[PDB]
Subunit: 115 residues, 3 copies
Amino acid sequence: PCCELITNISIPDDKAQNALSEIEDAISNVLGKPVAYIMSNYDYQKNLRFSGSNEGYCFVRLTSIGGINRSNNSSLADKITKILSNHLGVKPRRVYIEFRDCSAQNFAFSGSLFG
Amino acid sequence: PCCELITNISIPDDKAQNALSEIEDAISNVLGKPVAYIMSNYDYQKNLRFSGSNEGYCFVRLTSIGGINRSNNSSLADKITKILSNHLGVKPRRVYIEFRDCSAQNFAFSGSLFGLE
Amino acid sequence: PCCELITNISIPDDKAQNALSEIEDAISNVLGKPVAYIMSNYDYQKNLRFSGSNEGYCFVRLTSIGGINRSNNSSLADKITKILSNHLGVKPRRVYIEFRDCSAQNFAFSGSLFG
């Protein structure tokens, strides 16, 4: 799975990595997908806006081959939002999360398709 | 909705904010979605290329829970492209826009999924 | 087509664009699409993580209106991974590629829908 965090909140690299690691743990726990396949990123975007302002805000896009369903999505939305509020100080009402279900045939690793 | 602008065109932060605000207004007008629900971003990507060169270019990805259809897409393609050319100086022929639909069950706000039930 | 490269490997702009040019060539060949239609990007993301570490890694998202299929995906997965290993020094096993199909109705160019 892939976890893209896009935020106008700035924290040092170790603390950014710490937050990603906790999100990775939640993804591992809820989806049951192996660490080997988990990607995460903290993309600092100074011009990011939500609700017509540049106030602190986070958007997460989570892409997964399966595991995208009401139960998992609700669990991860709760967990990920809490992690972000804790480590980045973002208001829960300034956190959006998108869940994307993708097909195995549309992914490649080390130059070959999963199939 | 989420509106991700990716461009190799450098403009001052205040001007980037102004352009994003105008795009937000167009999105609200066409899709009927309140600004309160709109995310937008100006992602300066200096090495972004189109048609084999690093010449001025904009790519926009617009994601919305519904409202993705021929009439709305056409209207927003026209409105957004005009805003970009005006504010950024990009040539319309170097503006790409992608439209993405999302189900409410696959989108969360304040730690909870959108939709009922 | 659009090819978004996201990587925690930093290289100078001239070298970044060279890698992109080679990727563009490969895309043009495999998908039978002229360079005129190809967008590419090199997005340096220093905090990007894969498999639980911040070690050198490349993620590629390739979006096309059609041309997303086993043969094309397989061929491009092979070609793009080789390019990235050659040009960026990344290990093939830390190259992850996502292929996306987009409808022509959901893409616009020059202010008008495709096309």
